[PDB]
């Protein structure tokens, strides 16, 4: 069945970060890994995220949001950083494990 | 922002000691009696209990030698608060303020002045109004009338309870029947703040985009309201049980629910 | 930074004014009064509080 | 040139044990340090008291 | 127990040559040899060869930059990349017991580079550095400008990434450069200190970027130019050459011997070179200290020959002139049948000495196995060296004096002469 | 297997001539070879008045002998394709030749003719005098050696070892045909010399050719006895040659070493193997295994750094050297001293296991060719009195473990007053006192 | 040699240096007090209550 898919889409809409025009990955808290991850993003993706983020902040300061039309649709939310971030973590765990041996 | 936060907890603790000793100064029924019950609590600490209390009291019971050292403490602590506030803001400035969306705000920062100097001066008058309205129209709306009676060691008031801002913990104190456990529970009720940073499981910083965590948050608030209320009522049914219930939900929410719902939330985002 | 004494927002302060602080090599005993005045102060406040509590 | 450079004579200041340029200074080291440290360890004890 | 083994040397379908030689040394030294280098660069990707050289410790598909370094170090291993304008060698060293371990990384580096955009991006500023320490030797500065004045392409291409291109090379360029040059028919898996079967089993059942000759280097076209760098140094370096002999050519041995007859380096510490006509001739001309030598390079499809001279500024004129007269004087039959015999022997020795070094051997062995597929016996290379007439030498000499000369100099050249003044 | 390849390494033959000289060599199947005489002489053996002679001598050792003057001597060697090289340190001098095994004997002759009959032509001296004088000016600009000199200059201040191998400016300006002659006649003697060789040479054919040109016999018992040197006293101290005009700063720090004979030297080496070395051109960069190297990279602490265990007959220097920019000297030093402390208090088996392999590979590479082997034979005898084979070294290295590295380093580094030398724009590096305290508590 | 030994067992390791300062203090107190009290009393023979106490000590 599609239970898991029903839930996710629900939570995705429940969270509501898409009303700001942000993408799942735009909301990631910038801890050590996410930091390295971002540095690896190709310039075009970096600049775009930056605009998105800056735009979201401006909405926040304005106490507004984007018109329904412009909201990020669950199925079109691009996971632009996730791939990078995973390797960044793969790498770390390797080092962490190796320095132990 | 761990260090900003940890100094913060220290400010709270300090403010408590300060406001506690302050309240004894007018030496009224409640001043004295509250001081006698609250300070005696430590007597439950094993072996070094009684000693530590009689030391603090400067004698065998709250008497003149206490009143003086409290006045001393009360005059002192505020200044320590001021000092520590400087440290608080010092750590704070390392990172800069956080913001409602919880995402890096470097792409859009503004000079404190005039934006926030103005915004704060506005928020100052917005709150200051109710403060003055109260302080001037309903002066004793919050104070126990029992404190208009000079302290008298031969008349225990019917219901000895601390100031409102303490009730919530006084409540958790009576939840655990056992002089010792209840003290610790009290201590933990506030010291728990030091753990918050280590109980953050969400991949996001704020709760702006975490509806689950949000109700959990407002639940907890409501929970504190009830605890406050319980603290104000006597120790009898149905209060006693509601008390223990609220006290339990308090620690459960901060120690188990929050971090758990946090993790669950990550899976629902496909993280 | 490598050592905590310099990076930490607080130790950094204690360091730049009591540990790695540049001092002339030829100052005499007449410069000892700054510190004394300081100690002198902490001592008054300590004994003072103690007295105020009675 | 650096070849024309030599360390002055510290005989005026050297301790008795490291006075002779032909005797291993290591043998008297534990003594020289043991003393100074002994002085220090004592200052602590006094202070502690 | 351990004795005399015989240098084996297979060759697979795709053309990948595998040389090997067990000399029972307590330590090994495997190495991938390749037909690549700044020679194959185009105005559009200059430096990519260089950067590639520095990029050896970046992540691969089977090992991470972290594991590659930590891994090799865990067993006292070593990993290095040496390269000329037309050859790149990737070799590693370690103790017999850890070859199989060090091998993986070696394999990974040469046939599985990922050249991640970031890793690369953060590596490029290095060129600025690596290039700055090398140019501390004026010796290297003139040679770069030499090839520049000696050619119009292929070889004229600098060995160190040109300044303007630093930080402009791309992962693609690195990838392409590799896919087009590091092809099985341009590679050799030479390996001293191992059993041939073992080294073979690695190559085949492991190496996968393959087949073909890929991009082909344009013919080295001679120019005959003159580049002069006025910088102010009290010492002037100068090099005057002429198209010389190629590798694998018969006219090769001729120049080497002429080289030694003229003088190729001192053999006595702080000593004068009497056997060095060039050194000796110059010595009778100038009074202040200097140095002069017979410069000789042999490349795949061309070569360079002439002399090289480090001298005081004011006396750069006298020193270069001399080095010349001494070259013409050689062409005008000024060579003794003995001079030729002395040379031939210095050459034989020098050759034989520059092979004791495990590195020197692995290098000699591989060079052939790449531009040939064979191993010329030591008695043969000798039988080939002495078999050089007195004439042959005087002929080489002629060629230099007749051919078009290209010079390259650097320093306070105020008194140094131009190519058309010799 | 590694193990076997070691056992199968041919032995080093050592036989002593009735006159006291020792002839040693390792025979391989190699057509070329290296033979030479390694001497127990050097600046240490000099004194205030002749300091530099051994070097001035080095400058003339090749300018011809009595039997065959300059032109001839040079011409006779070049023409056979042989390479003649040599050097001189504080406690060791050596002249060696690289030529085909076929000339092993004619070589031996030449050698003996150099050490025994140096021309010392009055006219040559006055020239090499101007030459050496310039070599000093060129070396004066090599901060790395200007530093190690100063290091010694103070680590052994007031003693024989505190002298530069090249010597004073005065000493070189006035040394005489006599003093030089005297030095040779006083120091270059059979019992203190070793004719070593390696390549495709027959010990016999060698030893035979030895007795032939090294015949000079001794009569008295004194002539058979090698003189023991008055020892040098170490001193925890510092010397700071400042010059903000130099682009980078050079720092060297060290405690006293144990001396050739001591076994601990093996562990000490295993130790430095852990700290190792760095230099901006190491590609490993941030992943290098050496903690100091990493920090160096992560924090741009320096341009390079090296650990060393310079040994001597009765003493030594165990420390490190680094080149840094004026503003990163302190962090660098700070981190460095950190690692030394880490050695003493918390070394890991993982660390040593590696350090060992790195060391093994090191010893093996020290014997890469004939000159290097010959240099090892010429030295082992002169210092250890015999030859230590890789087979042995390995066993001594294999036996080292963490617990062991700790104890030793503690024994030689912990809470010891070190000798320090700084050159350049060293303002940020400061106070001996502070540095002294970096000598304890990890 | 005590200075040598002392150094080795007491002053070399920071941990033992501390242990010495403590135990050293504990013993120093005990002895410095007794001694000074002793000195003070002899310097004041027959003046302290401790001295004349016996005269009225009779329950
Ligand atoms: C402790 C002792 C107990 C004493 C009780 C203290 C007094 C309690 C009074 C009740 C509080 C009333 C607050 C009403 C505000 C409601 C509101 O606006 O909620 C919505 C709004 C939406 O947030 P976003 O997701 O960022 O939306 C962005 C789009 N523009 O939520 C917020 O404003 C954030 C919540 C901050 C207010 C929290 C204040 C409650 C204080 C109680 C103490 C609790 C903490 C633990 C203390 C331990 C001691
Ligand atoms: C009965 C007593 C029982 C109670 C015990 C409590 C005492 C516990 C004390 C712990 C021991 C301290 C550990 C010290 C370790 C740190 C250290 O390095 O030593 C201190 C270190 C010395 O350096 P090194 O000689 O190089 O040491 C080399 C070590 N291998 O620094 C010092 O100089 C400190 C010692 C001198 C103290 C000077 C203080 C003088 C003040 C006097 C005024 C009187 C006091 C009144 C206090 C006012 C309070 C209101
Ligand atoms: C004497 C009491 C205190 C004073 C005067 C004080 C003052 C401040 C000030 C001026 C700020 C910056 C503006 C703002 O965000 O409000 C601040 C921020 C902050 N304070 Fe306090 N504080 C006090 C108590 C506390 C306590 C009890 C805690 C929590 C246990 C705390 C936690 C913080 C933190 C985390 C910030 C960061 C705000 C952000 O998210 O950007 N403070 N405080
Ligand atoms: C700036 C340092 C201080 C100075 C120079 C100072 C000076 C004095 C002086 C001259 C007196 C009179 C003493 C006498 O002869 O009786 C005094 C008394 C007193 N001080 Fe301070 N004082 C200082 C700080 C304090 C502080 C910080 C406190 C406590 C908050 C304090 C509390 C008192 C009290 C309670 C007395 C009265 C009891 C007495 O006279 O002994 N003092 N002080």
For chain F, what are the domain ranges? Answer: 12-225, 237-440
Our CA-based measurement puts residue G25 at a distance from the nearest CA of chain F, in whole angstroms, of 23
**Burial class of residue E375 (count of CB atoms within 10 Å of its CB; 0-12, 13-18, 19+):** middle
Method: X-ray
DSSP three-state, residue E241: strand
Would you say F49 and F171 are in contact if contact means Cβ atoms under 8 Å apart? yes
Cα–Cα distance for residue pair B12/F78, rounded to 1 Å: 89
Nearest CA in chain F to E352: F32
Ligand 3 surroundings by CB, under 6 angstroms: B 1, 4-5, 8-9, 11-12, 81, 85, 88-89, 92, 97-98, 193
Number of domains in chain A: 1
What separation in angstroms does the CA of D34 have from each of B14, D27, D37, D38, G8?
47, 12, 5, 6, 8
User: Does the annotation mark B236 as catalytic?
Assistant: no
The stretches of chain B forming alpha helices (DSSP H) are 2-24, 29-40, 49-57, 64-95, 112-137, 164-175, 179-191, 211-232, 239-252, 258-268
To which H or E segment does residue E60 belong? Answer: none
Strand partners, E239: E308, E408
F12-225 and F237-440 share one fold: yes
Q: In whole angstroms, give the CA distance from residue B65 to residue B30.
A: 18
**Cβ–Cβ contacts within 10 Å for residue F71, how many?**
11
CA distance E64 to chain A (A): 8
Q: Which residue numbers of F are catalytic? A: 58
CB contact under 8 A, D49 and G1: no
Helix (H) or strand (E) holding G50: helix G49-52
Identify any residues that bridge with E151 across adjacent strands, giving them in sequence order: E222
Q: Are E304 and E146 in contact (CB under 8 A)?
A: yes
Cβ-contact F244, F427 below 8 angstroms: yes
Intrachain domains E1-210 and E222-422 with the same fold: yes
Rg (CA), chain B: 22
**Are A40 and E118 inside 8 Å of each other by CB?**
yes
Distance CA E33, CA F307 (A): 33
Yes or no, beta carbons of F169 and D7 under 8 Å apart: no
> Which ligand ends up closest to the CA of B10?
3
Look at residue F403 and give its three-state secondary structure: helix
Residue B60 tokens, joined: 């065998």
Superfamily of domain F237-440: Metalloenzyme, LuxS/M16 peptidase-like (3.30.830.10)
- For CA atoms F67, F70, F71, F76, the dihedral sign is positive
Measured CA to CA in angstroms, residue B178 lies from B22, B173, B182, B191, B244 at distances of 29, 9, 6, 20, 13
| Secondary structure element (H or E) that encloses residue F318, with its range | strand F316-324
Residue F427 in tokens:
């303002």
**At residue E376, what are phi and psi to the nearest 5 degrees?**
-60, 125
Measure B92 CA to ligand 3 centroid, in angstroms: 8
Asked if residue G25 has its Cβ within 6 Å of ligand 2, the reply is yes
CB of F115 closer than 8 Å to CB of F193: yes
Ligand 2 atom with the shortest distance to the CA of D36: 25
Q: What CA–CA distances, in Å, run from F333 to B244, E67, F154, F288, F369?
A: 60, 29, 19, 19, 37
Distance A24 CA to ligand 3 centre (A): 29
CB F99 within 8 A of CB F78: no
Distance (Å, whole) CA F78 – CA E322: 22
Q: Residue holding tokens 């030498």?
A: E393
CA nearest neighbour of E387 among E223, E239, E250, E235: E250
Fold of E222-422: Cytochrome Bc1 Complex; Chain A, domain 1 (3.30.830)
Instruction: Return the ∠ at Cα B179 (arms to B175 and B180), rounded to 5°.
Output: 105
Q: How far is F15 from E183, CA to CA, in rounded Å?
A: 56
d(CA F294, CA F275): 11
- Domains of chain B, first to last: 1-271 (1.20.810.10)
Q: Please, what CATH class does the domain formed by E1-210 belong to? A: alpha beta
In this complex, the residue of A20, A30, A53 whose CB is nearest that of residue B107 is: A53
Instruction: Please give the C-alpha separations between residue C14 and each of B93, C19, C23, D21, F433, in angstroms, as whole numbers.
Output: 18, 7, 15, 43, 20
Among E82, E106, E401, E73, CA closest to E258:
E401
Nearest CA to ligand 3 atom 1: B11
Q: How far is Cα E28 from Cα E31, in angstroms, rounded to an integer? A: 10
Q: Is B93 labelled a binding residue? A: yes
Q: What distance in Å separates the CA atoms of residue D5 and residue F150, rounded to the nearest whole number?
A: 8
Contact F158 D23 (CB under 8 A): no
Tell me the CA–centroid distance for residue C48 and ligand 4, in Å: 5
Q: Is the alpha carbon torsion for D14, D19, D21, D26 positive or negative?
A: negative
Contacts of E349 in chain F (CB under 8 A): 32, 81-82, 99-100
CATH of F12-225, one of 3.40.190.10, 3.40.50.740, 3.30.830.10, 3.20.10.10: 3.30.830.10
Nearest CA to F283 out of E182, E109, E207, E27 is that of E109
Beta bridge partners of F24: F14, F196
Q: What number of other Cβ atoms are within 10 A of residue D27's Cβ?
A: 11
Resolution (A): 3.2
Residues contacting B109, CB < 8 A, separation 6+: B96
Three-state SS for F240? strand
Question: Are F181 and D16 within 8 A, CB to CB?
Answer: no
CA distance B63 to D27: 67
Q: How far is B128 from chain A (nearest CA, A)?
A: 24
Q: Which of C44, C47, C53 to mutate to test the pocket of ligand 4 (most atoms within 8 A of CB)?
A: C44
Rg (CA), chain E: 23
**Which pair of tokens denotes residue F329?**
């000297």
The CATH number of D1-49 is 1.20.5.270
> What are the sequence ranges of the domains in chain D?
1-49
- Is the dihedral angle over the CA atoms B102, B107, B108, B109 positive or is it negative? positive
Ligand 1 close to Cβ of residue A63 (< 6 A): yes
The rounded distance, in Å, linking the Cα atoms of A4 and B268 is 8
Strands E226-230 and E405-411: what pairing?
parallel
CB of F38 closer than 8 Å to CB of F190: no
* Pair F200, F105: CB distance under 8 Å: no
Do residues F106 and F212 touch, judged by C-beta distance below 8 A?
no
Strand order in the sheet with E290-299: E226-230, E405-411, E235-243, E302-312, E290-299
Identify the nearest ligand to the CA of F415 by its number.
2
Q: With CB atoms and an 8 Å threshold, state whether A8 touches B209.
A: no
- 3-class secondary structure, F277: strand
Indicate the number of domains in chain G.
1
**Residue E323 in contact with residue E286, Cβ under 8 Å?**
no
Angstrom distance (rounded) from CA E49 to CA F58: 45
Report the nearest atom of ligand 2 relative to the CA of F440: 30
Q: Where in the sequence is the domain holding G30, given as residue range(s)?
A: 1-59
Q: How many CB atoms lie within 10 A of CB B213?
A: 20
Query: Using CA atoms, how far apart are residues B18 and B74, in angstroms rounded to an integer?
Result: 6
Whose C-alpha lies nearest to ligand 1, atom 22? Answer: B208
Q: Please name which ligand lies nearest the alpha carbon of B6.
A: 3
Ligand nearest to the CA of B228: 1
The residues in E 272-311 lying below 8 A from A, measured between CB atoms, are none
Q: Please say whether the beta carbons of E226 and E131 come within 8 A.
A: no
> How many C-beta atoms surround the C-beta of residue B158 within 10 A?
6
The encoded tokens of residue F125 equal 């001296």
Residue nearest to atom 14 of ligand 2 (CA): G18
Which residue has tokens 């301790």? D15
Is E274's CB within 8 Å of F75's CB? Answer: yes
Report the first-to-last Cα separation within chain D, whole angstroms.
56
Do D and A touch (≥3 CB pairs < 8 Å)? no
Indicate the Cα dihedral angle F421, F424, F428, F430, nearest 10°.
Answer: 20
Q: What is the CB-side half-sphere exposure of residue E346 using CA atoms within 13 A?
A: 27
CA triplet F241, F242, F245: central angle to 5 degrees?
Answer: 130
Q: Which of G1, G7, G28 sits opposite D33 (nearest CB)?
A: G7
Asked if E253 and E385 touch (Cβ cutoff 8 Å), the reply is: yes
- The answer to whether the CB of E287 falls within 8 A of the CB of E207 is no
Contact F/C (≥3 CB pairs under 8 Å) = yes
Interface list for chain G against chain F, based on CB atoms closer than 8 Å: 12, 14
- The answer to whether the CB atoms of B208 and A56 lie below 8 A apart is no
The Cα of B169 is separated from the nearest Cα of chain C by a number of Å equal to 29
Query: Checking DSSP bridges between strand E302-312 and strand E405-411, what pairing results, if any?
Result: unpaired
Judge: F441–G14 Cβ closer than 8 Å, yes or no: yes
**All partners of chain B with 3 or more CB pairs under 8 angstroms:** A, C
Chain A environment of E66 (Cβ under 8 Å): 91, 94-95, 98
Q: State which ligand 4 atom lies nearest to the alpha carbon of C45.
A: 27
User: Residue E342: which of F287, F79, F190 has the closest Cα?
Assistant: F79
């Amino acid at each position: 069945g599609r239970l898991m898919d029903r839930i996710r889409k629900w939570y995705y809409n429940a969270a509501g970060f898409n009303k700001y025009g942000l993408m799942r990955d735009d909301t990631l808290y910038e801890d050590d890994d996410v930091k390295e991850a971002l540095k690896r993003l190709p310039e075009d993706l970096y600049n775009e995220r930056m605009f998105r983020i800056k735009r979201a902040l401006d909405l926040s300061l304005k106490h507004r949001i984007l018109p329904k039309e412009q909201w990020v649709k669950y199925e079109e939310d691009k996971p632009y950083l996730e791939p990078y971030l995973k390797e960044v973590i793969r790498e770390r765990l390797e080092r962490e494990a190796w320095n132990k041996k | 922002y761990k260090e900003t936060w940890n100094t913060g907890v220290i400010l709270l603790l300090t403010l408590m000691a300060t406001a506690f000793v302050g309240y004894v100064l007018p030496w009224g029924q409640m001043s004295f009696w509250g001081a006698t019950v609250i300070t005696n609590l430590f007597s439950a600490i094993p072996y070094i209990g009684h000693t530590l209390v009689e030391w603090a009291w400067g004698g065998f019971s709250v008497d003149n030698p206490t009143l003086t050292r409290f006045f001393a403490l009360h005059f002192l602590l505020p200044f320590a608060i001021a000092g520590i506030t400087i440290i608080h803001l010092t750590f704070l400035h390392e990172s800069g303020s956080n913001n409602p969306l919880g995402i890096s705000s470097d792409s859009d920062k503004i000079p404190f002045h005039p934006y926030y100097s103005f915004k704060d001066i506005l928020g100052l008058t917005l709150m200051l109004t109710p403060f003055l309205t109260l302080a001037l129209f309903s002066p004793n709306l919050l104070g126990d009338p029992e404190n208009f009676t000079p302290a008298n060691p031969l008349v225990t008031p019917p219901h000895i309870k601390p100031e409102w801002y303490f009730l919530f913990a006084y409540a958790i104190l009576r939840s655990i029947p056992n002089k010792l456990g209840g003290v610790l529970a009290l201590a933990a009720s506030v010291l728990i703040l030091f753990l918050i940073p280590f109980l953050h499981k969400s991949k996001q910083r704020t709760m702006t985009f975490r509806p689950l965590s949000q109700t959990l948050f407002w639940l907890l608030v409501a929970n504190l309201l009830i605890l406050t209320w319980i603290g104000s009522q006597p120790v009898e049914h149905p209060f006693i049980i509601i008390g223990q219930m609220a006290s339990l939900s308090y620690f459960t929410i901060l120690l188990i629910l929050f971090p758990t719902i946090g993790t669950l939330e990550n899976k629902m985002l496909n993280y | 930074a490598p050592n905590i004494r310099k990076s930490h927002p607080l130790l950094k302060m204690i360091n730049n004014s009591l540990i790695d602080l540049p001092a002339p090599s030829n100052i005499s005993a007449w410069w000892n009064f700054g510190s004394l005045l300081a100690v002198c102060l902490m001592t008054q406040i300590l004994t003072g509080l103690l007295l105020a509590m009675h | 040139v650096h070849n024309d450079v030599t360390v002055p004579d510290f005989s005026a200041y050297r301790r008795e044990d490291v006075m002779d340029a032909t005797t291993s200074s290591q043998t008297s080291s534990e003594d020289r340090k043991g003393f100074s440290y002994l002085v220090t360890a004592t200052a602590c004890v006094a202070t502690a008291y | 127990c351990p004795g005399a083994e015989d240098l084996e040397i297979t060759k697979l379908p795709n053309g990948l040559i595998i040389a090997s030689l067990e000399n029972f040394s307590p330590a090994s030294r495997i190495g991938v040899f390749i037909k690549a280098g700044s020679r194959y660069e185009t105005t559009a990707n200059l430096g990519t060869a260089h950067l590639l050289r520095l990029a050896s410790p970046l992540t691969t598909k089977g090992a991470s930059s972290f594991r590659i370094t930590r891994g090799i170090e865990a067993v006292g291993g070593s990993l290095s990349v040496y390269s000329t304008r037309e050859k790149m060698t990737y070799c590693v060293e370690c103790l017999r017991d850890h070859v199989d371990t060090v091998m993986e990384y070696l394999l990974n580096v040469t046939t599985a580079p990922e050249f991640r955009p970031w890793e690369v991006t953060d590596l490029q500023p290095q060129l600025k550095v690596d290039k700055a320490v090398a140019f501390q030797s004026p010796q290297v500065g003139v040679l770069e400008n030499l090839h520049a004045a000696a050619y119009k392409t292929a070889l004229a291409n600098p060995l160190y990434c040109p300044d303007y291109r630093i930080g402009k090379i791309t992962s693609e360029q690195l990838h392409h450069f590799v896919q087009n040059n590091f092809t099985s028919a341009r590679m050799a898996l030479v390996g001293i200190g191992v059993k041939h079967s073992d080294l073979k089993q690695v190559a085949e059942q492991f190496l996968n970027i393959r087949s073909g000759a890929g991009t082909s280097s344009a013919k080295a076209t001679y120019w005959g130019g003159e580049i002069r760098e006025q910088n102010g140094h009290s010492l002037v370096h100068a090099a005057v050459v002429t198209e010389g002999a190629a590798v694998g050519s018969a006219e090769a041995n001729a120049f080497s011997v002429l080289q030694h007859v003229l003088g190729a380096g001192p053999l006595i510490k702080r000593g004068s070179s009497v056997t060095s006509k060039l050194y000796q001739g110059v010595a009778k001309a100038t009074t202040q200290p200097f140095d002069a030598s017979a410069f000789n390079v042999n490349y795949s499809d061309s070569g360079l020959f002439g002399f090289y001279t480090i001298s005081q500024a004011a006396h750069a004129g006298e020193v270069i002139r001399a080095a010349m007269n001494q070259l013409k004087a050689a062409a005008q039959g000024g060579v003794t049948e003995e001079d030729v015999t002395k040379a031939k022997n210095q050459l034989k020795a020098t050759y034989l000495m520059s092979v004791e070094t495990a590195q020197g051997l692995l290098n000699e062995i591989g060079s052939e196995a790449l531009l040939s597929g064979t191993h010329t016996a030591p008695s043969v290379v000798a039988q080939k060296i002495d078999s050089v007439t007195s004439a042959d030498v005087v002929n080489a000499a002629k060629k230099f004096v007749s051919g078009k000369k290209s010079m390259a100099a650097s320093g306070d050249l105020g008194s140094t002469p131009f190519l058309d003044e010799l | 297997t590694y193990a076997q390849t070691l056992q199968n390494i041919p032995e080093t033959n050592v036989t002593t001539l009735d006159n006291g000289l020792r002839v040693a060599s390792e025979e391989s199947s190699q057509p070329t070879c290296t033979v030479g005489v390694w001497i127990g002489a050097g600046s240490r053996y000099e004194n205030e008045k002749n300091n530099g002679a051994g070097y001035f001598v080095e400058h003339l050792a090749f300018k011809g002998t009595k039997k065959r003057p300059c032109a001839a001597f040079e011409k006779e060697v070049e023409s056979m394709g042989a390479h003649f090289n040599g050097y001189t340190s504080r406690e060791q001098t050596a002249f060696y030749i690289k030529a085909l095994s076929k000339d092993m004997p004619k070589v031996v002759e030449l050698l003996a003719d150099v050490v025994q009959n140096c021309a010392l032509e009055e006219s040559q001296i006055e020239k090499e005098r101007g030459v050496i004088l310039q070599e000093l000016k060129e070396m004066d600009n090599d901060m790395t050696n200007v530093t190690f000199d100063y290091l010694h200059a103070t680590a052994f201040q007031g003693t024989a070892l505190a002298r530069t191998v090249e010597g004073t400016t005065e000493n070189i300006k006035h040394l005489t045909r006599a003093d030089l002659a005297s030095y040779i006649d006083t120091h270059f003697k059979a019992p203190r010399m070793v004719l070593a060789a390696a390549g495709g040479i027959s010990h016999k054919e060698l030893v035979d050719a030895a007795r032939q040109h090294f015949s000079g016999v001794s009569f008295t018992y004194k002539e058979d006895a090698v003189p023991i040197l008055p020892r040098c006293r170490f001193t925890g101290s510092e010397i700071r040659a400042r010059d903000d005009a130099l682009p980078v700063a050079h720092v060297a720090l060290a405690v006293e070493g144990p001396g050739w004979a001591d076994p601990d030297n093996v562990v000490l080496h295993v130790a430095n193997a852990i700290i190792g070395r760095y230099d901006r051109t190491f590609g490993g960069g941030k992943h290098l295994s050496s903690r100091l190297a990493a920090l160096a990279v992560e924090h741009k602490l320096c341009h390079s750094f090296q650990t060393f265990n310079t040994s001597y007959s009765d003493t030594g220097l165990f420390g490190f050297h680094f080149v840094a920019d004026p503003l990163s000297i302190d962090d660098m030093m700070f981190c460095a001293q950190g690692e030394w402390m880490r050695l003493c208090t918390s070394t890991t088996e993982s660390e040593v296991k590696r350090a060992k392999n790195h060391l093994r590979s090191a010893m093996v590479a020290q014997l890469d060719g004939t000159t290097p082997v010959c240099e090892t034979i010429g030295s082992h005898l002169l210092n250890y009195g015999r030859r230590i084979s890789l087979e042995e070294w390995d066993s001594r290295i294999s036996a080292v473990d963490a617990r062991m590295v700790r104890d030793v380093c503690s024994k030689y580094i912990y809470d010891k007053c070190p000798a320090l030398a700084a050159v350049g724009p060293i303002e940020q590096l400061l106070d001996y006192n502070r540095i002294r305290s970096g000598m304890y508590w990890i | 040699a005590l200075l040598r030994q002392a150094y080795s067992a007491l002053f070399r390791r920071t941990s033992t240096f501390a242990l010495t300062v403590v135990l050293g203090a504990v013993l120093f107190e005990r002895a410095f007090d007794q001694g000074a009290d002793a000195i003070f009393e002899h310097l004041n023979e027959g003046k302290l209550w401790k001295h004349i106490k016996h005269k009225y000590e009779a329950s």
